[PDB]
Amino acid sequence: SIGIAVILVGTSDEVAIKDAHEKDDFHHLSVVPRVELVAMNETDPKSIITRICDLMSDRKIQGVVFADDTDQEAIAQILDFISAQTLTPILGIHGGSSMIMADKDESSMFFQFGPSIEQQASVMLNIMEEYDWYIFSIVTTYFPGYQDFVNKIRSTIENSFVGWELEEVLLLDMSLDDGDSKIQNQLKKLQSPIILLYCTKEEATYIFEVANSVGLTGYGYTWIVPSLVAGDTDTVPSEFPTGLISVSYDEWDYGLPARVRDGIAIITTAASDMLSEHSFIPEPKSSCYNTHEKRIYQSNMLNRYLINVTFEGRNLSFSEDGYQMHPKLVIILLNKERKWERVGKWKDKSLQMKYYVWPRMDDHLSIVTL
Amino acid sequence: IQNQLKKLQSPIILLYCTKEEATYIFEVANSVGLTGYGYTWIVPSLVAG
Amino acid sequence: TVPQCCYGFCIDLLIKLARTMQFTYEVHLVADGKFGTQERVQNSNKKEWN
Amino acid sequence: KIVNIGAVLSTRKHEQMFREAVNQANKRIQLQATSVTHKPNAIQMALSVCEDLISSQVYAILVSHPPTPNDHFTPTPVSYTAGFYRIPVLGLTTRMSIYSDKSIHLSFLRTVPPYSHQSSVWFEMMRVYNWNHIILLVSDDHEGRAAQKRLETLLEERESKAEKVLQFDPGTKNVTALLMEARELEARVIILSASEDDAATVYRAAAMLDMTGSGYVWLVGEREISGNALRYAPDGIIGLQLINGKNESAHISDAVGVVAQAVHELLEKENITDPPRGCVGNTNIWKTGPLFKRVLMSSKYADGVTGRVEFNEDGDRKFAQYSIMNLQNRKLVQVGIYNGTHVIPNDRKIIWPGGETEKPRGYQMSTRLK
């Protein structure tokens, strides 16, 4: 009898997903979930909060599934705020709510499908290990998470038997006005054919313009960037050099055909497991106004039951931080033409490439032996 | 000039230019910074004037 | 922990060292039985000597 | 033009004081006043915040802690609503360390020093007293871990670590094991940093084990002095306190002055775009507000009622003042003032634990080796 709402914003296949929602197989459980398809425009945080409040106060809402289509990142912060102020868990599966926030509050109940930065750093190291690239360098600017990335890459390079070599790690800063001289004097010490870059879109374009003014991006230099530099795979800033390799989430194979269905199934099976084990079902008066008296019920055991679910032969165990920890990552690269062509797929801790040798794009002579 | 002077790796440099050209290349090298501690440059008798 | 008695080169060396340095001591054997090496386990928040 | 000022406090007298302050600031270019009280609930608080931002369209908002003693979750809705549109929000009476991190809050500046920089005062006091050996015993939490990391970095800067580090679970009932382990070391200086509730139990268990005799020096923070912890406190504690901690109007006047200086330095810039008055309408990031925050953080204040106030690149006030309080026979007495970088004592003397009057060695070189 749990209430679950599905909110959509912007342009999307509203009728298609509304028809697909009535295709769940929940006959082997006594859940009878109240489903309410609500569609509107992502106008502002206030309207979103008001709609959430109204739908929750309508009829005993015990869960919220969210999907968006905009590019705003603060919407995830608003969702975290809501899930912190009221103990009803929510799930952001697609849209603006796909921006992963690592520093969440203690009493928050929010889980997304975004991959952790450590997972991306491990994937981009497994790629180098499968490509036999034992020489690399690190360049990054002032950003909330660069230190964590450096610490993770150091922890994963120090605890491995394969001989690697870190050389000339920099901490350049482009925020200083007229700092082109410092950037040019700092980037002049790079001597590795593999570069790891972690910056922002504007900072990435600026450092790429600087490196192209220098010229270490044409033939043999191959740079790798995490999933925050891309932003949108449809547009190209035209400043990114050729032969760029990045990692992203598998959204082209499944935008939202069954993501909402999987989320609803996970919520239902977790509620059923909690009701079976703890012999209790959380269904209080989910009201927005005058909720200070409703702080007698805690959702810690529910969270303890939400991070252990396995359905349809797939691992969905989340982590305490709030990411999936079992995603299906893909490996894309920027070829001659301005585009992102998918090449490899990384799922279930396994790698699956497409080309036996990496395309290099004279002094490249093959050799026949016996 | 900045992309060309970035390949110098010798502690002794031989320079042969004109007074204005010498001042310009010295300003460039000081913007880079290879003239302070260990780099010793030698110039012929036409740079002094 | 059964109380045994030890004797040998290092024993009398430590005796002379404590005599010339004028202090007291309370010896005890090794816990695991190894000189010492790095123990690299996946163990993300763990790295020490054994 | 007509640019109002934003401030959200809960007091009629403080509201009138802020009105007079902004009037005097405008007298020193038309600046209006916009003030909203505090609500018991925070969702309605954020709703009213967006409503007031719609009805006023302010550049930056001021916020202070209400008379409620929590001071933890009160400014979080305001900070979230500010960061949703990338506009700066300044705090007045909030000293939590979670706000110091720029990850959660992209734009947030405080006017009081955090507990992390308070640990540096302990470093200076140990340096001027020649106390190289210390026993850092703190709790296990976000603020505790941040303070411990700051102290460890400031100690390792001088190529010297801590003698021992002990952590206990907050909200516990038995800490005899940690005290027994600490009492078998060579150091005689025990630093403490936790909440007022834990300090009483810590002092009780310490006095129960005769760990408060002569030769031991205790160091705590402002939070471990006030509250009911004062009932269980040995004589000779050297604590700290803020000069304008509970005085809101003193900080409000300086905040009004610095924000007036900021807007006066701002209105003479190009490409000025006022934030949209459409809280419900707009869905993008205002072109102004990030740059305004950047120039406000670097805006060196002229003068204030609390001295020259500066700000580092962390959203925290620098070069503050602390009252070095002490406990002498159940009677609080001041010993000196921390004037930015120098500790100047008064004519009075210090009464160390046990009754002796002499600088303790803080290092007992007992000779019983293993």
Curated annotation (Swiss-Prot), chain B:
Expressed in the hippocampus including the dentate gyrus (at protein level). Detected in adult olfactory bulb, brain cortex, hippocampus, striatum, thalamus, superior colliculus, with much lower levels in inferior colliculus, midbrain and cerebellum. It comes from the Eukaryota. Phosphorylated on tyrosine residues. It is found in: Cell membrane; Postsynaptic cell membrane; Late endosome; Lysosome. The extracellular N-terminal domain (ATD/NTD) endows NMDARs with a unique capacity for allosteric modulation, harboring several binding sites for small molecule ligands that act as subunit-specific allosteric modulators of ion channel activity. A hydrophobic region that gives rise to the prediction of a transmembrane span does not cross the membrane, but is part of a discontinuously helical region that dips into the membrane and is probably part of the pore and of the selectivity filter. Belongs to the glutamate-gated ion channel (TC 1.A.10.1) family. NR2B/GRIN2B subfamily. Heterotetramer. Forms heterotetrameric channels composed of two GluN1/zeta subunits (GRIN1), and two identical GluN2/epsilon subunits (GRIN2A, GRIN2B, GRIN2C or GRIN2D) or GluN3 subunits (GRIN3A or GRIN3B) (in vitro). Can also form heterotetrameric channels that contain at least two GluN1 subunits and at least two different GluN2 subunits (or a combination of one GluN2 and one GluN3 subunits) (in vitro). In vivo, the subunit composition may depend on the expression levels of the different subunits. Found in a complex with GRIN1, GRIN3A and PPP2CB. Found in a complex with GRIN1 and GRIN3B. This is Glutamate receptor ionotropic, NMDA 2B. It comes from Rattus norvegicus (Rat).
From Swiss-Prot, chain C:
It is found in: Cell membrane; Postsynaptic cell membrane; Synaptic cell membrane; Postsynaptic density membrane. Glycans are attached at Q22, Q42. NMDA is probably regulated by C-terminal phosphorylation of an isoform of NR1 by PKC. Its phosphorylated state is influenced by the formation of the NMDAR-PPP2CB complex and the NMDAR channel activity. Detected throughout the brain, in brain cortex, cerebellum, thalamus and olfactory bulb. It comes from the Eukaryota. Belongs to the glutamate-gated ion channel (TC 1.A.10.1) family. NR1/GRIN1 subfamily. Heterotetramer; the NMDAR subunits are modular and harbor tiered domains that function in concert to regulate opening and closing of the cation-selective ion channel pore. Forms heterotetrameric channels composed of two GluN1/zeta subunits (GRIN1), and two identical GluN2/epsilon subunits (GRIN2A, GRIN2B, GRIN2C or GRIN2D) or GluN3 subunits (GRIN3A or GRIN3B) (in vitro). Can also form heterotetrameric channels that contain at least two GluN1 subunits and at least two different GluN2 subunits (or a combination of one GluN2 and one GluN3 subunits) (in vitro). A hydrophobic region that gives rise to the prediction of a transmembrane span does not cross the membrane, but is part of a discontinuously helical region that dips into the membrane and is probably part of the pore and of the selectivity filter. This is Glutamate receptor ionotropic, NMDA 1. The gene is Grin1.
Curated annotation (Swiss-Prot), chain D:
Heterotetramer; the NMDAR subunits are modular and harbor tiered domains that function in concert to regulate opening and closing of the cation-selective ion channel pore. Forms heterotetrameric channels composed of two GluN1/zeta subunits (GRIN1), and two identical GluN2/epsilon subunits (GRIN2A, GRIN2B, GRIN2C or GRIN2D) or GluN3 subunits (GRIN3A or GRIN3B) (in vitro). Can also form heterotetrameric channels that contain at least two GluN1 subunits and at least two different GluN2 subunits (or a combination of one GluN2 and one GluN3 subunits) (in vitro). Component of N-methyl-D-aspartate (NMDA) receptors (NMDARs) that function as heterotetrameric, ligand-gated cation channels with high calcium permeability and voltage-dependent block by Mg(2+). NMDARs participate in synaptic plasticity for learning and memory formation by contributing to the long-term potentiation (LTP). Channel activation requires binding of the neurotransmitter L-glutamate to the GluN2 subunit, glycine or D-serine binding to the GluN1 subunit, plus membrane depolarization to eliminate channel inhibition by Mg(2+). Glycans are attached at Q32, N174, D210, N247, N271, Q321, N339. It comes from Rattus norvegicus. Detected throughout the brain, in brain cortex, cerebellum, thalamus and olfactory bulb. A hydrophobic region that gives rise to the prediction of a transmembrane span does not cross the membrane, but is part of a discontinuously helical region that dips into the membrane and is probably part of the pore and of the selectivity filter. Belongs to the glutamate-gated ion channel (TC 1.A.10.1) family. NR1/GRIN1 subfamily. This is Glutamate receptor ionotropic, NMDA 1. Residues 1-370 are extracellular. It comes from the Eukaryota. Disulfide bonds join C50-C279.
